[PDB]
Amino acid sequence: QSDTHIFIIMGASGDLAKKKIYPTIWWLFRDGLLPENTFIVGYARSRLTVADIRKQSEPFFKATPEEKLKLEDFFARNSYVAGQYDDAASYQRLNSHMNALHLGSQANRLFYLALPPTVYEAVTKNIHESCMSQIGWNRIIVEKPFGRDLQSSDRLSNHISSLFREDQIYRINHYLGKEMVQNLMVLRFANRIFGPIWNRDNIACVILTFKEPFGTEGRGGYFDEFGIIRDVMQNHLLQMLCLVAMEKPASTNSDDVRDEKVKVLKCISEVQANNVVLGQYVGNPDGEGEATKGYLDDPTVPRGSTTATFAAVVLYVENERWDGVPFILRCGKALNERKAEVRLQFHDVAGDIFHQQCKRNELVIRVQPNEAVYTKMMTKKPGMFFNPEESELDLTYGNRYKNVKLPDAYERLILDVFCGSQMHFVRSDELREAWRIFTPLLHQIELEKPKPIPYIYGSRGPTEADELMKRVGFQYEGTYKWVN
Amino acid sequence: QSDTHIFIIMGASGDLAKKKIYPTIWWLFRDGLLPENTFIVGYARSRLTVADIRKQSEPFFKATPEEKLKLEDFFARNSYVAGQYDDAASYQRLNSHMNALHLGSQANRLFYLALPPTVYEAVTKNIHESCMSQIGWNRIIVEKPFGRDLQSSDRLSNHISSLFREDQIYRINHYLGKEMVQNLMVLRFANRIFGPIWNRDNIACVILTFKEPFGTEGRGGYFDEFGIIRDVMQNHLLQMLCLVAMEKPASTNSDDVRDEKVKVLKCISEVQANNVVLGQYVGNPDGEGEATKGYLDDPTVPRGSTTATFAAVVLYVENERWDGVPFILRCGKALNERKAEVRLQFHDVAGDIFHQQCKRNELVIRVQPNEAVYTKMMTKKPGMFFNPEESELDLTYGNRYKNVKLPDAYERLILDVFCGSQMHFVRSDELREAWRIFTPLLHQIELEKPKPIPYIYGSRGPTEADELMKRVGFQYEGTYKWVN
Amino acid sequence: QSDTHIFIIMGASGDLAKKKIYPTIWWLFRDGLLPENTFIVGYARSRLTVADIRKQSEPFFKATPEEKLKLEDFFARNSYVAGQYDDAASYQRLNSHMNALHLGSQANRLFYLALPPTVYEAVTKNIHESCMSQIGWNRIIVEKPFGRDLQSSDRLSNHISSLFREDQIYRINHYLGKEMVQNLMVLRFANRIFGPIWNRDNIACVILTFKEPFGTEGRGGYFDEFGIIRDVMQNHLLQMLCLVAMEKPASTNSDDVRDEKVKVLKCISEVQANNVVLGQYVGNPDGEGEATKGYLDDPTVPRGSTTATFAAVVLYVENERWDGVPFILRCGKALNERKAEVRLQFHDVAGDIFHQQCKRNELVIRVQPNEAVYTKMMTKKPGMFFNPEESELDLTYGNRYKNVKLPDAYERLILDVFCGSQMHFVRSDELREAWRIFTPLLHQIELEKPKPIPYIYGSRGPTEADELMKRVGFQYEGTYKWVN
Amino acid sequence: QSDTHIFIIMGASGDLAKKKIYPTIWWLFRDGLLPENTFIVGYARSRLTVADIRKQSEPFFKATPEEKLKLEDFFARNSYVAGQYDDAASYQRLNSHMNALHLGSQANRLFYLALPPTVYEAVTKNIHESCMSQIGWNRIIVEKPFGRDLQSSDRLSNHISSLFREDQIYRINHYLGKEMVQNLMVLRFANRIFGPIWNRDNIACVILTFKEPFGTEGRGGYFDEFGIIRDVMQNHLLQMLCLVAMEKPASTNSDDVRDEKVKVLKCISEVQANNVVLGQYVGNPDGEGEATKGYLDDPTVPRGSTTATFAAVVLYVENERWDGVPFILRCGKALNERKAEVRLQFHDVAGDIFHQQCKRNELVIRVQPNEAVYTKMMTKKPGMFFNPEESELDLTYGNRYKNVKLPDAYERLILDVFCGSQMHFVRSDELREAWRIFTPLLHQIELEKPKPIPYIYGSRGPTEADELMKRVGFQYEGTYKWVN
Ligand SMILES: NC(=O)c1ccc[n+]([C@@H]2O[C@H](COP(=O)([O-])OP(=O)(O)OC[C@H]3O[C@@H](n4cnc5c(N)ncnc54)[C@H](OP(=O)(O)O)[C@@H]3O)[C@@H](O)[C@H]2O)c1
Ligand SMILES: NC(=O)c1ccc[n+]([C@@H]2O[C@H](COP(=O)([O-])OP(=O)(O)OC[C@H]3O[C@@H](n4cnc5c(N)ncnc54)[C@H](OP(=O)(O)O)[C@@H]3O)[C@@H](O)[C@H]2O)c1
Ligand SMILES: O=P(O)(O)OC[C@H]1O[C@@H](O)[C@H](O)[C@@H](O)[C@@H]1O
DSSP, X not given: OOOOEEEEEETTTSHHIIIIIHHHHHHHHHTTOSOSSEEEEEEESSOOOHHHHHHHHGGGSOOOGGGHHHHHHHHXXXXXXXXXXXXXXXXXXXXXXXXXXXXXXXXXXXXXXXXXXXXXXXXXXXXXXXXXXXXXXXXEEEOSOOOSSHXXXXXXXXXXXXXXXXXXXXXXXXXXXXXXXXXXXXHHHSOSSSSTTSSTTTEXXXXXXXXXXXXXXXXXXXXXXXXXXXXXXXXXXXXXXXXXXXXXXXXXXXXXXXXXXXXXXXXXXXXXXGGEEEEEEEOOTTXXXXXXXXXXXXXXXXXXXXXXXXXXXXXXXXXXXXXXXXXXXXXXXXXXXXXXEEEEEEOOOSSOOSTTOOOOOEEXXXXXXXXXXXXXXXXXXXXXXXXXXXXXXXXXXXXXXXXXXXXXXXXXXXXXXXXXXXXXXXXXXXXXXXHHHHHHHHXXXXXXXXXXXXXXXXXXXXXXXXXXXXXXXOOOOOOOOOOO | OOOOEXXXXXXXXXXXXXXXXXXXXXXXXXXXXXXXXXXXXEEESSOOOXXXXXXXXXXXXXXXXXXXXXXXXXXXXXXXXXXOSSOXXXXXXXXXXXXXXXXXXXXXXXXXXXXXXGXXXXXXXXXXXXXXXXXXXXXXXXXXXXXXXXXXXXXXXXXXXXXXXXXXXXXXXXXXXXXXXXXXXXXHHSOSSSSTTOSTTTEEEEEEEEEOSSOOTTXXXXXXXXXXXXXXXXXXXXXXHHHHHOOOOSSSOHHHHHHHHHHHHTTBOOOOTTSEEEEEEEOOTTOOGGGGOOGGGOTTSOTTOOOOSEEEEEEEBOSXXXXXXXXXXXXXXXXXXXXXXXXXXXXXXXXXXXXXXXXXOEEEEEEESSOEEEEEXXXXXXSSOOSEEEEEEEEETTTSSTTSXXXXXXXXXXXXXXXXXXXXXXXXXXXXXXXXXXHHHHHHHHHHOOOOEEEETTSOOOXXXXXXXXXXXXXXXXXXXXXX | OOOOEEEEEETTTSHHIIIIXXXXXXXXXXXXXXXXXXXXXXXXXXXXXXXXXXXXXXXXXXXXXXXXXXXXXXXHSEEEEEOOSSOHHXXXXXXXXXXXXXXXXXXXXXXXXXXXXXXXXXXXXXXXHHOOOSSSOEEEEEOSOOOSSHHHHHHHHHHHHHHXXXXXXXXXXXXXXXXXXXXXXXXXXXXXXXXXXXXXXXXXXXXXXXXXXXXXXXXXXXXXXXXXXXXXXXXXXXXXXXXXXXOOOSSXXXXXXXXXXXXHHHTBOOOOTTSEEEEEEEOOTTOOXXXXXXXXXXXXXXXXXXXXXXXXXXXXXXXXXXXXXXXXXXXXXXXXXXXXXXXXXXXXXXXXXXXXOOOOOEEEEEEESSOEEEEEEEEEOSSSOOSEXXXXXXEETTTSSXXXXXXXXXXXXXXXXXXXXXXXXXXXXXXXXXHHHHHHHHHHXXXXXXXXXXXXXXXXXXXXXXXXXXXXXXXXXOOOOOOO | XXXXXXXXXXTTTSHHIIIIIHHHHHHHHHTTOSOSSEEEEEEXXXXXXXXXXXXXHHHHHTOOGGGHHHHHHHHHSEEEEEOOSSOHHHHHHHXXXXXXXXXXXXXEEEEEEOSXXXXXXXXXXXXXXXXXXXXXXXXXXXXXXXXXXXXXHHHHHHHHHTTSOTTTEEEOOGGGGSHHHHXXXXXXXXXXXSSXXXXXXXXXXXXXXXXXXXXXXXOHHHHHHHHHIIIIIIIIIHHHHHHHHOOOOSSSSHXXXXXXXXXXXXXXXXXXXXXXXXXXXXXXXXXOGGGGOOGGGOTTSOTTOXXXXXXXXXXXXXXXXXXXXXXXXXXXXXXXXXXXXXXXXXXXXXXOOSTTOOOOOEEEEEEESSOEEEEEEEEEOSXXXXXXXXXXXXXXXXXXXXXXXXXXXXXXXXXXXXXXXOTTSOOHHXXXXXXXHHHHHHHHHHHHOOXXXXXXXXXXXXXXXHHHHHHTTOOOOOOOOOOO
């Protein structure tokens, strides 16, 4: 017997919903990864029907002629109900239409909240008081952002946790659903090559890079509200840091992994204001199209704003394994390229017998694009040479696994929610630690309004970040020559 | 000022000379790697000329029409003198011919002995008493084999050492001149990734593989005399074992490296008779041409001989780093392929959290063919899967350094002799140790005449070697699937 | 301001109360370690008075004539109330009495349940329903034993946890109050000489020894119900194992330490019945007094009882640090001495160059008697010798800290309860793991009624225990000679 | 058959001879450690007899009334021969006299050189040309000092080595004869508790302490020539450093240990002049006897002498195990006490959770006086405390082996020479490295004549040495309180 499963999309008319969630679940249904008895009901304020959302989301489905029959099946399993985000009567109407399905009750309920944070409290309280299943399990899915600082996020976290247990809250951080972020755990805890060397005795510094080649591109209101720190460094870089620095769990269970992650987070001290470089981008006079406009050009930006579009922050995990090793979290929009990269720079080899010609090893795990694990090792120079040179032991997903499709992060996250695996989600304690690490710095920046170092659009950011990276021990040589 | 260097070929008419030496030195001179004032004198019993050896060695030079001018320069710097290996008059004739050359006096003689071992004593004593330069450095080069057992090799080694200083003997083991064998030092002494894990605490067993897809093909008299053990295991496999198991040298100097190599050799006990698997090949019923004949189907092989064409022997290096870890030296002619491979099977990951789906990691360093370093590591299965699968971090010479021509071993060895580097050459004491481990086993086999396990030509050798591999610790699963 | 503290003792007329708790609180008050406004309330079914319990507990105070004034103050701060363990009226009578003090409302109430396990239900429920302070904190204290198996302990733990939070439940395991047992953490996580070597890579086996030189001596009825396993191995030896094998906590907070302990408990597999040696003592024919009778020679012991007074059980902690290392928990009553010992036998030194004259090093931390930490180390033989003998690096409390007094465990435990430090107390999940490790073994023993190996009173128990110890990896030599 | 052995003491009338070598050989013969065919021949310029040497060396024998008969036996096996150190005729006369003894031809001759270094060249030349046994082995024993700098030591070492083989030259460093110095090898290579932590990953700095409570005491003419560096630092402290830092030998043979020691020597760079603190003691104005006079208050010391009687020198071993760890060699005469001590200060425990109360562990080995090995550990404060404090795991020889008399170093050195064990003797290459480490510093000090920091007699030397120790990483706290 296959239990009935139901997927609910809040704000089904929303941008995020029609842009990512509906294509994600359609792709998952195309591969048959959901249980056989799966229904989908949309919910928003807009008075739409299944046909309206269908024609709105079809261009994002990436469908081909071979899958019409499955497409009409999928939209025969879809539904929509209109209502408000605070009127209960809409929620009893939704529940009445909700039970009117096959097996509708024993069904395992599942809610996705693709809504602005300003309505999270009301939506979650109404779902708790009205849309709770009596037989199957109920799992609610919240979305980034989670508050603005320690207290603002803490009040929301306590409001949600007071309503649902920790096994029913699924905080989405879609980089945790990436292929390489998951592969971090298997590389760390399934290989003896990477076991003894994963400590402060060998690792000089850890660099987690996040770059984007475009700016806010005319949508500067929300970025002005938040900043690059709150957007990326608080969640994406910090989860990659937790996966990198976590201790070996007792098992592969979600609770053990999240306990290790929160234990690692608890060992991080406050972010000092002398370890942070902020940058804001201005238009490139020789750029193309959007490259000629800066962050002060976007009208969606109040005049004279100090919001930074780049940041390089050092974190220290004070524990027996990571004491003294800097964790350089450098992220920034409007940079020269797109790259999510985990770079562990190892210490110099003890007793260099190669006359200072050797350089630091760098295990690099590029999350996106071109998923690949390569360790920058020192091999002997091929030919009639004896001095060593930097090479790599490369494993690229795209040259070794061409015939397999690395799925989208949302697909895997939703599949994990369906299967009950909560390993790749943010816990309340982990969120509290993540917010308390950065809250003093955010408050200091908000109250003081510093001047971020200007950096031209499309450049590699302010040089002050590079000065910081050199200062905190990271060594950059620029002698690494790589050819595909 | 560049000192004159003279290359000397004993037995210049020999097969080894015309097939490997003259092409090697021609390639070295073609790239300008030899000193500008370089002359070459040939010596053998046959009364030949420069033109005769020229036309004999032309098919092996791999010459090109644009290289013709350099070819005539090369053969203008060549000369030939005939004589006897026992008559001194020929030796002072050669010396006088040398003195009639560009500053012969201050010239740096360099001797090569491409002769059968039966004349090494006489040739070396005559060279010492008649052919020594009074100004520049003098170095001789002796060739495999080095005796037959401990005492037979010891007498020759003492005779040579009593005549020449250890900075003058250059014992050729051309597998030391291979690209990957020399790289072994860089891989482990220039990387912090391979340092902490290079011990008995992480390595379960070490396998050194040497395979040949072909048999002896009418040259079976010498192989019947020797046996695969003293052919390949005493020198090639054992030197790869020394380089794998050596300690970190104080410097890249030759003497230091040879010191740790002999130190590691001194920690190996002699071979027990219960750790040896021996095989003799018989023709394949459905073979092709040469494959239809066995080792006993060769007319020059004496009838009813028990000489084996395959050997898998387990060695133990009882020291603080290699105590208890087997060193399975598996070699065999008439096997299914050609491969020189160094395989380190690491221990099972402690506290397996992936439900025994992980398998032992293996750093594999394939010397030839298709030089490549790949660590068989456990990565997460790409796509909608969570169990790990075997993969590799691959660095291949040919896909990364396709424009770089990896030279022949003899080229690099002769260049090392010219440059005075003795790092990749056999010193007397590690030769004595290497013969010490294997001599009792060779004597026991010679006296007892065991029966080697018959294995079909072109097969993977006897299954008893695989049984030994399982018995001593090595784990084989056969689930590794690799695509280029 | 010093808040009022009230120490309420259930079963004030009890044996354990009068012989251990009243002397403990009197000693704590005599040294001035209690808050100034501290009062003690007695409670039991007996209609005793303050003077009655006073004269009953004088002989166990070890009081002195010069302390008469402080003793009079102590008993001026004492009180007693008679009542029932299930009648609520007595509970609000105690509440009204306790409130009728100085600050008898803002007081910090502290309860000790020195009662048989059969009344924990009623006492806990009545205390929760009637005897809570609305201003100060309220902490309850429970005592060994905790059930008989997994389910019996689970029901009691769930009932207690359903009424009190984990910061208000204080589970007493007086071996956690021992000096060496708490010093284990400082040995492990504060010294760099015991950190790198505290893993499976250097430890051959782990032995925790518990010995008593006397049998049940006339109380065999109580011991027959439980057995030595449930008496010692489930709590004392197992918590010693947890403190030995625990990973380094994030901080010295109680929650971190208990989380590490329960994490280590989660990694222990269930006890197989092939690693248990049960023993029942038989009367020594030439003993003195009590030694002439066996376990079956006691009137209150049921006839034909196969209860074991000795046990040696091997535990395996399947994790990264303790994979494969056996954990022999050897306990036994009527043995040859009284001794609680933590013995860590290290592996043989790899690459032994002393001609097998060396033996395994042993880290010993003797909890009692004569608290001492010594490492059975290999030093060179003093005098005109070159071979090593087995010696020790001894730190003995009594020769180094003679002038300081070693306090009783209950004293420091009660002081920790007063200070709110819950570091050395058992958590509920720790009980669940400690009981699930042993429950199938105890159930199978109870069902099958096996036959314990008889051993003479005053001997060292069955020799099958020694056979098991040598089988699982422990090497006993008997060559260790020690002189005081 | 017991081969005859002959003990020859060159300069038998010398100060060192009658103070140390005659009582040493007498003690060795008293205990029957010598072969029963043992004879002793003296030689010097003085025209003394057996009775004269007897009456001169009796007070230093420490004889007792019960061993006269042993004294008459010993002096019946004693003989004296007069002659010169450059006249051959005396040497053939000695050869004739010493052959004219039982088995005076197969006897194993063994020579001791208790002579000033100015005559070593002539004495070794004559003894090689005239007094060599043609049947039994011959071993020559030399004494400190070995030259004054690199070239002065090299010339004498080459002269000695050009006449005798390395298995016959026995260079005396009587500290290598000390109990603790030899025991260092058993500490390191026979214990699993001191092996893993014996590297740069756990050791912060190394201090080798040598202190003397008395000045030059009227022998300033000899000490002015050399200085404290050449006196103790070049040999005693540095050989202790070599034996502490050495890699584990392949076997307990002498050549393996000596090779490891010279390998460690080869990894040390020349001594820079910015890490050397020199001190010259001056008279304490309130001293007693010799404490009231300084090094300038001794008539035989040349006026205006800048020779240093104290030195703290920082050494680095650039190898895989000791990279970055400073080696502080702090030695000085006229200090506050007498002490030879090996102190290894370990790094701070990473991720300290005890709020900076922990301090660096210090493995301390006191060579003399009161031989003891103790590791300064951090244990919990006994009693009603929870903070850790400094303690030690103490093994003191005098409390554990009080009935075992630790023999003099010269006794064991002579017994080693008799037995052929050359483990504890200095090699020529060892001397070369030891001298090239310090030679540039000594030459610079001689050429520029610095001014050492004055320090009063009986003090702990200049405070600049303490400043240097603090700067190079050593953390002195002064809070370590020890009670016997
Ligand atoms: N692939 C290889 O052949 C190979 C590989 C590695 C090592 N080696 C070693 O290198 C050496 C080169 O010899 P080879 O392989 O080229 O075989 P080879 O042709 O039989 O010997 C080479 C030359 O040595 C002379 N020679 C042969 N037999 C002799 C004998 N009984 N007495 C005196 N001189 C004799 C001959 O000089 P003349 O022509 O003037 O008469 C012959 O031309 C051999 O020792 C071989 O073991 C060979
Ligand atoms: N406690 C120590 O003094 C001590 C400790 C360790 C090492 N050493 C070393 O051991 C060696 C023994 O010397 P020592 O301490 O006993 O002092 P020493 O008395 O001056 O030298 C002992 C012998 O040296 C001879 N001698 C004296 N002056 C000489 C000169 N100009 N030329 C040649 N020979 C001369 C004398 O031979 P005659 O009596 O026959 O004339 C005397 O017997 C010295 O090199 C010293 O560095 C000494
Ligand atoms: O501790 P010991 O054995 O007395 O060593 C001290 C002596 O050792 C010698 O090497 C020095 O030359 C002397 O100056 C010093 O007094």
